[PDB]
Design a protein around this ligand. Sequence first.
Ligand SMILES: Cc1cc(-c2nc3cccnn3c2-c2ccnc(NC(=O)c3cc[n+]([O-])c(C)c3)c2)ccc1F
Length: 338
Amino acid sequence: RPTFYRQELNKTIWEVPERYQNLSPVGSGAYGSVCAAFDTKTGLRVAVKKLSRPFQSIIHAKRTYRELRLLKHMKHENVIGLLDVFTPARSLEEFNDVYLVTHLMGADLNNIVKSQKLTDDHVQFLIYQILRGLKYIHSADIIHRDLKPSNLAVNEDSELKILDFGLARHTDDATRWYRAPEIMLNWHYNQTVDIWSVGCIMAELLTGRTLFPGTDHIDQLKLILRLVGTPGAELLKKISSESARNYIQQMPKMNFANVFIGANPLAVDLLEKMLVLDSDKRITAAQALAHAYFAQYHDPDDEPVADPYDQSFESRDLLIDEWKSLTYDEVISFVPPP
Ligand SMILES: Cc1cc(-c2nc3cccnn3c2-c2ccnc(NC(=O)c3cc[n+]([O-])c(C)c3)c2)ccc1F
């Protein structure tokens, strides 16, 4: 077992193995607290997260287990994963704090873009990576559901990782804009809700402007439907509720070639396939990777899928100490990546 040391940062007490040196605050919130550190074992700059009240309640405990299970399963270049998980506890009976370690990330997609058009080649590379990560996430039967530029970390090499959180804003420094209409309308949904978000992101990277900057929930839907049209006959046949059919209903789809003026025609074609109203007809991540737009990056032998992901715990109602013990097992069984 490593030697630990204690340090106070922004009024939060940190107890970490000596390998993590030079702790500096990154941020804190409902998520707990995050510090940056230097990992002396690897020479990497890392972020360390101390979870907030991980076993305070059944729900917190289950949330902690969920978070750790997911992070341990996600092993892909374009998805956030774990370098380390630790606890100062020497036994289950002492186990009260959980610390997670990953690569320190310093910028998100908004930070790289800065309200500017990116070049088409840069868009290809970034969207390729998002789709590559999504193919992996979706293959684990996970839907991200909240994909947006703030959840996309991008380093100086434009290497991209999909996050389920936003990076901390410097102390001296809408979500709905990327949400699929079926979620906005409360309609059954599939993994292509995330593909909608990617289409929104891609549009913005190409044009330098938010595709659907709705002022509120109703406005958001109005902006979406102006582009993608009111539901056609085939989609209306799939809406089970009378009131729902009575509600959504009046203009036809716009021709995206007349919207995304000067864009690569293959980009326009891909956007048409991602921004389809009917989610049954929306392109999947795997299909999108094979689209001609990505011909310079696509490698069908290097777009891996995840191992099957057992999420049966989601259906279980257990006690705190049970979730705590399951979590502790997961801490102990952790094997760092190479
Ligand atoms: C799985 C896992 C997740 C997180 C983690 N959780 C959160 C929650 C909210 C915000 N951030 N966050 C992070 C995290 C992870 C990496 N890097 C940053 N880095 C910055 O936020 C930043 C922002 C500006 N600057 O200038 C720098 C240098 C860093 C945060 C930490 C460890 C971990 F193992």
